[PDB]
Structures are given as structure tokens and as C-alpha cells.
Design a protein around this ligand. Structure first.
Ligand SMILES: [Zn+2]
Length: 79
């Protein structure tokens, strides 16, 4: 059995959840590559593997860096 979101297991599936994404400085592509799909409202995203949620993204933020900073034990980051 699978403890992760099978639905959001592919980069492609995560990418396809973004519609009218409000930030010009952080792309749906970058977020999907870092394991994040759109949950909202606003700029809130969730990891398919650890279930970590992040919002209030800053221009300086790197999605993979923030994933590791906030959710260091995430199994997606390790494999
Ligand atoms: Zn994660």
C-alpha cells in the first residue's frame, strides 16, 4: 500500500492543478518539480509525499530550499 498521494505522485499531475496562479516570481513548474500541488486559497501548496503545506511565498524563495527548510524528513527529498 501507498502512504503518499498517488493522485499527485507525478510532476505532470501536480503542474495541472495550477490555474490563474497569482505569483509572477515563482512558477507552477518549479513548485511541481519540488513535489508541490495547488491547494489554495491564495498561494498555498501541499507536498504529495510529506503533506507539508506552504503559503506566503517571497521573491527570494526557492521551492526545493523551502521544502527542505520546513519539512527536512520528507521522503520525496530523500528519494
Ligand atoms: Zn514533502
Amino acid at each position: 500500500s501507498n502512504p503518499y498521494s498517488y493522485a499527485m505522485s507525478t510532476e505532470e499531475a501536480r503542474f495541472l492543478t495550477y490555474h490563474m496562479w497569482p505569483l509572477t516570481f515563482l512558477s507552477p513548474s518549479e513548485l511541481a518539480r519540488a513535489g508541490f500541488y495547488y491547494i489554495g486559497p491564495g498561494d498555498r501548496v501541499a507536498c504529495f509525499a510529506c503533506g507539508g503545506k506552504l503559503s506566503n511565498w517571497e521573491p527570494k524563495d526557492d521551492a526545493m530550499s523551502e521544502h527542505r527548510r520546513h519539512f527536512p524528513n520528507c521522503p520525496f527529498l530523500e528519494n
